[PDB]
Design a protein around this ligand. Structure first.
Ligand SMILES: O=C(O)CNC(=O)C(=O)O
Ligand SMILES: [Mg+2]
Ligand code: NI
Ligand SMILES: [Zn+2]
Length: 331
């Protein structure tokens, strides 16, 4: 069995290997990359996402989110307080202000220590989930707006044509902006490209061990767990690496830098934080191997998770027994 310890693997495809996206995902899986839940892909030196980032300041962040924490430093939830609209240029200035800027630090490990010690005492503002793309239309390789759609994959595997669309999303981050522990909708893959700026640190639980994380979360967030049998779908709970190690939960960590892709694999729980002002692009995708994960994915039906239009068909076709309850939670 490849990668039996479920380590995060790092790949360096050549320009020739960068042509066929699906083939390369399958290659990484042949080497056991999915066992980690997360892989890094460093593009060939010949590749670029676009020519420059000099002209992005007028992008609008319609609903910046202030991420307010509750709990203790290693075990907390965050809620998202909506803020007034601002441009990317305005947000960048805000990220660089004394109130929000990255502190002095020695290295990524010192900054990680500072994040976990201090995150709860601040409320950073995240420009998340903005429909759009920064790939040039002429970038033909690993262009996250030109991937095969999940609707087409389901149709190719299962024969059923479905409604829905699959487009990318932009994330503008600052120091301490945080992504809570989650798997993707319908336990899909995700791919994330860090276009510019400061790094993003990731934590990940191997898919084979995801239920260990779920059981810890139920213990640590006992009110939330009574509320909803899949409350990690709410994407609000954080657990630090120190707490995970104290509780024996298998996980790994890695820092993504500008110019690098990360891929999350079906049912790979992940969480993390941004180091400073940055911009990422991410989208969900599927492969044939996903279908069995999609059929078994948990679902939130309490009302909280509320998701895209295109999840309807995935539930309806892959999980018909759960569909009526789930759709009630959507309404
Ligand atoms: O970058 C972020 O805030 C969150 N991204 C992801 O969870 C992802 O790409 O799957
Ligand atoms: Mg602009
Ligand atoms: Ni994700
Ligand atoms: Zn719920």
């Amino acid at each position: 069995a490849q990668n039996p310890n479920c380590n995060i693997m790092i790949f360096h495809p050549t320009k020739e290997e960068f042509n066929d996206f699906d083939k390369y995902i399958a290659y990484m899986e042949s080497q056991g990359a999915h066992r980690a839940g997360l892989a890094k892909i460093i593009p060939p030196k010949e590749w670029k996402a676009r020519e420059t980032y000099d002209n992005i300041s007028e992008i609008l962040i319609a609903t910046p989110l202030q991420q307010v924490a509750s709990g203790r430093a290693g075990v907390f939830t965050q809620y998202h307080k909506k803020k007034k609209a601002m441009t990317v240029g305005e947000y960048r200035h805000l990220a660089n202000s004394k109130k929000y800027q990255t502190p002095p630090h020695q290295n990524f490990e010192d900054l990680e220590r500072k994040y976990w010690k201090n995150r709860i005492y601040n409320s950073p503002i995240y420009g998340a989930d903005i429909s759009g793309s920064l790939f040039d239309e002429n970038t033909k390789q690993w262009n996250l707006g030109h991937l095969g759609t999940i609707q087409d994959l389901l149709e190719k595997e299962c024969g059923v044509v479905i409604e829905g669309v699959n487009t990318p999303y932009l994330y503008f981050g600052m120091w301490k902006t945080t992504f809570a522990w989650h798997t993707e909708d319908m336990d899909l893959y995700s791919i994330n490209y860090l276009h510019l700026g400061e790094p993003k640190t990731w934590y990940v639980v191997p898919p084979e061990h995801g239920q260990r994380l779920e059981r810890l979360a139920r213990e640590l967030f006992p009110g939330s767990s009574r509320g909803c049998g899949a409350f990690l779908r709410h994407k609000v709970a954080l657990i630090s690496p120190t707490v995970l190690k104290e509780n024996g939960i298998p996980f790994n960590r890695i820092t993504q830098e500008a110019g690098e892709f990360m891929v999350t694999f079906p049912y790979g729980y992940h969480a993390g934080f941004n180091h400073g002002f940055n911009c990422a692009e991410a989208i969900n995708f599927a492969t044939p191997r996903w279908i069995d994960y999609g059929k078994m994915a948990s679902q939130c039906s309490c009302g909280e998770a509320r998701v895209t239009f295109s999840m309807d068909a995935f539930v309806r076709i892959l999980q018909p027994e759960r569909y009526d309850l789930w759709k009630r939670g959507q309404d």
